Amino acid sequence: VLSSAVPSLPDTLRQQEGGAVPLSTQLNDRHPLESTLKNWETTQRQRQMEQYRQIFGIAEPMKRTMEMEIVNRTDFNPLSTNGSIHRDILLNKECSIDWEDVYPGTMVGDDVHSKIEKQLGI
């Protein structure tokens, strides 16, 4: 979140990260597996949609993505980070476990209203 007083700096306080000490330029030395592993699921999903587009046409990816957006955007529960029950069915992860599920992972900026604003971009 950028500072309200100056719209060019991160809001060190509202962005509770241990001070401004974790500065932007320094988040460049990363674990080799961090970038690949963080968005591994996304790459597989997009690759899967590409194959559907090639074979089944653009209609099938449109139907798949529209259903997911319907589920995601109609689901707002600011008291749970767990994925929706119907999200697993569409992703076909209703009988699978992963470290992201076992390990899902402050006084200031963790309130519900913070997620309400982000959810609606208000």
Task: Report if residue 77 touches another protein, rule: CB under 8 A.
Answer: yes
Single out the residue of 74, 81, 105, 106 in contact with another protein (rule: CB under 8 A). 74
Is there binding between residue 106 and another protein (CB under 8 A)?
A: no
Judged by CB under 8 A, which stretch of 21-29, 34-42, 111-119 contacts another protein? 111-119
78-117: buried (b, 16+ CB within 10 Å) or exposed (e) per residue?
A: eeeeebeebeeeeeeeeeeeeeeeeeeeeeeeeeeeeeee
Judged by CB under 8 A, the stretch of 21-29, 30-38, 109-117 that binds another protein is: 109-117
The yes or no reply on residue 115 touching another protein (CB under 8 A) is no
Whole-number Å distance between alpha carbons of 66 and 72: 10
